[PDB]
Ligand SMILES: O=C(O)c1cccc(-c2cccc(F)c2)c1
């Protein structure tokens with residue numbers, strides 16, 4: 001069951017942007033979106049790929065645990081937070097592309113392809129460079145496909161160990177207070193048109209879970225804060241969060 005609520009479009013047009021929000025009520029097994037078409041259009045996953053990438057690296061032993069330090073390679077990059085040592089927690093918090101590029105090289109093309117098929121992730125296509133295919137290669141995923149993947153992760157049903165899934169869900173922790181917990185990952189795709197931002201994850205309540213996946217047009221980095229801001233406005237309107 002899916003229902004289209006075009007009133008949410010106001011949240012995008014009021015900021016003179018365009019995008020889609022997809023919600024899934026786990027208890028009721030019901031979905032909601034403002035745009036059924038865009039909910040099924042496939043985009044580059046960009047840094048949302050750090051979820052599956054982290055899982056594969058952990059399950060193959062490329063990453064030992066969430067404390068292992070990945071030393072800065074000494075190359076000054078334009079993102080200040082990238083020019084320092086990281087572990088899995090901080091690498092995902094600051095979307096540290098260079099750390100995950102090295103993960104992918106050590107994973108290798110063959111094992112990466114095999115695992116993405118086992119995850120049923122997007123179009124499962126790693127065509128391109130092994131260290132950048134999620135940024136400018138052939139892989140694609142829709143918002144509805146993100147939710148399908150995240151639901152498997154939440155229930156520990158992906159084809160990796162329970163430990164790997166618990167560690168990645170820890171690394172996804174974004175916000176927690178007395179009312180809800182959010183585990184999620186942002187994305188920012190600029191190398192292939194259209195330029196978009198992602199935010200995918202879920203909201204934990206006392207007695208239910210709401211999965212979400214949003215993407216929106218991102219002509220400039222000036223609107224990146226809208227990924228979370230717009231999503232939370234939808235959540236408040238639907239009385240999922242206060
Ligand atoms: O949205 C983020 O969490 C994030 C984290 C790291 C770098 C960037 C970023 C911002 C502007 C340009 C760019 F290429 C990357 C965004």
Ligand SMILES: [Cl-]
Nearest residue numbers: 169170171173
């Ligand atoms: Cl946690």
